[PDB]
Design an enzyme around this catalytic site. Structure first.
Site, PDB file in Angstrom:
ATOM      1  N   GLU A 160       0.823  -1.248   0.000  1.00  0.00           N
ATOM      2  CA  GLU A 160       0.000   0.000   0.000  1.00  0.00           C
ATOM      3  C   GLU A 160       0.831   1.260   0.000  1.00  0.00           C
ATOM      4  O   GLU A 160       0.511   2.212   0.751  1.00  0.00           O
ATOM      5  CB  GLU A 160      -1.044   0.041   1.185  1.00  0.00           C
ATOM      6  CG  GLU A 160      -1.878  -1.268   1.132  1.00  0.00           C
ATOM      7  CD  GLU A 160      -3.065  -1.241   2.052  1.00  0.00           C
ATOM      8  OE1 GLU A 160      -3.105  -0.527   3.071  1.00  0.00           O
ATOM      9  OE2 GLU A 160      -3.974  -2.069   1.802  1.00  0.00           O
ATOM     10  N   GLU A 164      -6.468  -7.383  -2.373  1.00  0.00           N
ATOM     11  CA  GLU A 164      -7.017  -7.433  -1.019  1.00  0.00           C
ATOM     12  C   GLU A 164      -8.462  -6.969  -1.040  1.00  0.00           C
ATOM     13  O   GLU A 164      -8.736  -5.989  -1.783  1.00  0.00           O
ATOM     14  CB  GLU A 164      -6.302  -6.519  -0.003  1.00  0.00           C
ATOM     15  CG  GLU A 164      -4.816  -6.782   0.298  1.00  0.00           C
ATOM     16  CD  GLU A 164      -4.285  -5.872   1.350  1.00  0.00           C
ATOM     17  OE1 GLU A 164      -5.088  -5.166   2.055  1.00  0.00           O
ATOM     18  OE2 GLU A 164      -3.048  -5.740   1.557  1.00  0.00           O
TER      19      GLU A 164
HETATM   20  O1  LIG Z   1      -7.057   1.077   3.076  1.00  0.00           O
HETATM   21  C1  LIG Z   1      -6.810   0.163   4.151  1.00  0.00           C
HETATM   22  C2  LIG Z   1      -5.665   0.924   4.912  1.00  0.00           C
HETATM   23  O2  LIG Z   1      -6.448   2.026   5.516  1.00  0.00           O
HETATM   24  C3  LIG Z   1      -5.549   2.894   6.276  1.00  0.00           C
HETATM   25  O3  LIG Z   1      -6.322   3.936   6.826  1.00  0.00           O
HETATM   26  C4  LIG Z   1      -6.640   5.011   5.976  1.00  0.00           C
HETATM   27  C5  LIG Z   1      -7.962   4.820   5.227  1.00  0.00           C
HETATM   28  O4  LIG Z   1      -7.757   3.823   4.191  1.00  0.00           O
HETATM   29  C6  LIG Z   1      -8.336   6.124   4.486  1.00  0.00           C
HETATM   30  O5  LIG Z   1      -7.421   6.341   3.400  1.00  0.00           O
HETATM   31  C7  LIG Z   1      -8.322   7.347   5.428  1.00  0.00           C
HETATM   32  O6  LIG Z   1      -8.542   8.531   4.662  1.00  0.00           O
HETATM   33  O7  LIG Z   1      -6.959   7.413   5.994  1.00  0.00           O
HETATM   34  C8  LIG Z   1      -6.712   6.275   6.895  1.00  0.00           C
HETATM   35  C9  LIG Z   1      -5.552   6.500   7.831  1.00  0.00           C
HETATM   36  O8  LIG Z   1      -4.367   7.062   7.278  1.00  0.00           O
HETATM   37  C10 LIG Z   1      -4.960   2.129   7.486  1.00  0.00           C
HETATM   38  O9  LIG Z   1      -6.006   1.724   8.380  1.00  0.00           O
HETATM   39  C11 LIG Z   1      -4.214   0.879   7.010  1.00  0.00           C
HETATM   40  O10 LIG Z   1      -3.770   0.065   8.061  1.00  0.00           O
HETATM   41  C12 LIG Z   1      -5.078   0.078   6.044  1.00  0.00           C
HETATM   42  O11 LIG Z   1      -4.264  -0.989   5.533  1.00  0.00           O
END
Ligand SMILES: OC[C@H]1O[C@@H](O[C@H]2[C@H](O)[C@H](O)[C@H](O)O[C@@H]2CO)[C@@H](O)[C@@H](O)[C@@H]1O
Ligand SMILES: *[C@@H]1O[C@H](CO)[C@@H](O)[C@H](O)[C@H]1NC(C)=O
Ligand SMILES: *[C@@H]1O[C@H](CO)[C@@H](O)[C@H](O)[C@H]1NC(C)=O
Ligand SMILES: *[C@@H]1O[C@H](CO)[C@@H](O)[C@H](O)[C@H]1NC(C)=O
Ligand SMILES: *[C@@H]1O[C@H](CO)[C@@H](O)[C@H](O)[C@H]1NC(C)=O
Length: 344
Positions: free
Chosen positions: A169, A276
């Site tokens: 990611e 995923e």
């Molecule tokens: O997409 C799964 C990942 O999410 C991450 O949190 C993000 C969320 O996706 C979204 O983009 C929001 O705007 O910001 C969040 C925090 O930065 C994490 O939870 C990560 O562990 C996941 O894999």
């Protein structure tokens, strides 16, 4: 048969068979210390009909852990260490040994965007800067590439590697989208210089694509442009992930997310992997339509749910979260055995 995994048309060729595949995510398989627990878990994934497993290829620390604890790399300003001992990459060597025995293929990312098992944050603690300057931090990138070489050179001639993956990611919040284009171009060229047998992919979520509905995941606030990334010559296929509960969207919106990414991979002449996905509420009801969309959309080469759960001979259970699909459960029947039966 056992051969290297290649692309034929816009499909994958796995051990001589060209066609759509189902797989699963098992990050935690890489940190098991009892060989019997890797063998029972891979026996269950193989007998369910899955062909590909995604495992972590990293475990980064800034201080060495309590004695007996697994660690793959210690990051420090005064000299970093890559652990090739029994509490280090020898745990991943057994995972690759078991995949060869069970006829499974592995996707292996080299770093985490997030702080779980160290991530970009463990490099920032050792080499300074922050999470967005990491991509152009010379001391951090010099150590990241030394760790890439240490992992790739172990398994470069093994037929159990599905693909090398630059990270889990990768994001560059608020950055120009060219910072990840230039870093992914240079690092994938480096991986190809170490290993000409295996496919390479980015590991991104798929964020940033203008053919959608304008929800946040389609916009450009996380530093990635999906169409620009999958056009890089040294990346062989595209990846995308899907989590409506974290992204503020409804579950049925996921069908259009699969369709738009599939079409962008097919426009670039390459397969996409739906790498995923999960729904926290009613996963059998809400994730089954996604698996049917992915199987019946041109441009898709396979899909991997997040995530496998299993249990061991001594009565312990694996690591898990609210998206775990436990082997032999009713959700395994719904999302694993019924989906493998529909593929073939
Ligand atoms: O997409 C799964 C990942 O999410 C991450 O949190 C993000 C969320 O996706 C979204 O983009 C929001 O705007 O910001 C969040 C925090 O930065 C994490 O939870 C990560 O562990 C996941 O894999
Ligand atoms: C990260 O560092 C860069 C370079 O100094 C800076 O421009 C950017 O605003 C910083 N990020 C945060 C969140 O402070
Ligand atoms: C290992 O694979 C590389 C290509 O990455 C190839 O050049 C080399 O000959 C192979 N090693 C053996 C012993 O076949
Ligand atoms: C959810 O979202 C889509 C738009 O993104 C909307 O068209 C649809 O009616 C909604 N469906 C449900 C079941 O909420
Ligand atoms: C899985 O379920 C079958 C019954 O359908 C059973 O024979 C087998 O022991 C079970 N496997 C495990 C690991 O419990």
């Amino acid at each position: 048969a056992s051969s290297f995994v290649t692309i034929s048309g816009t499909q994958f060729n796995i051990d001589g068979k060209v066609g759509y595949f189902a797989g699963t995510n098992c990050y935690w398989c890489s940190f098991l210390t009892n060989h019997a627990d890797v063998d029972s878990t891979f026996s269950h994934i193989s007998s369910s009909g899955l062909k590909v497993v995604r495992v972590w290829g990293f475990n980064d620390v800034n201080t060495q852990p309590s004695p007996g604890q697994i660690w793959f790399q210690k990051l420090s300003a005064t000299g970093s260490t890559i652990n090739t001992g029994a509490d280090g990459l020898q745990t991943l060597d057994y995972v690759v040994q078991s995949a060869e025995q069970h006829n499974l293929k592995l996707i292996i990312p080299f770093v985490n965007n997030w702080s779980d098992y160290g991530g970009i944050n463990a490099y920032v603690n050792a080499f300074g800067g922050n999470a967005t300057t990491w991509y152009t931090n010379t001391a951090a990138q010099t150590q990241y590439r030394k760790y890439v070489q240490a992992v790739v050179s172990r398994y470069a001639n093994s037929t159990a590697i599905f693909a090398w993956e630059l990270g889990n990611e990768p994001r560059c919040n608020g950055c120009s989208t060219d910072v990840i284009v230039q870093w992914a171009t240079s690092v994938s060229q480096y991986v190809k210089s170490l290993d000409s047998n295996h496919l390479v992919t980015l590991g991104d979520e798929g964020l940033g694509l203008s053919t959608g509905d304008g929800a946040y995941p389609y916009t450009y606030g996380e530093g990635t442009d999906f169409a620009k990334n999958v056009q890089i010559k040294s990346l062989d296929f595209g990846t995308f992930h899907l989590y409506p509960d974290s992204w503020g969207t409804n579950y049925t919106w996921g069908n259009g997310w699969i369709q738009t990414h599939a079409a962008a991979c097919l426009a670039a002449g390459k397969p996409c992997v739906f790498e995923e996905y999960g729904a926290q509420q009613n996963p059998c009801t809400n994730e089954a339509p996604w698996q049917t969309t992915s199987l019946t959309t041109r441009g898709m080469g396979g899909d991997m749910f997040w995530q496998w759960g299993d249990t061991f001979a001594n009565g312990a259970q694996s690591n898990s979260d609210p998206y775990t699909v436990w082997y032999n459960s009713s959700n395994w029947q719904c999302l694993v055995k019924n989906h493998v039966d529909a593929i073939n």
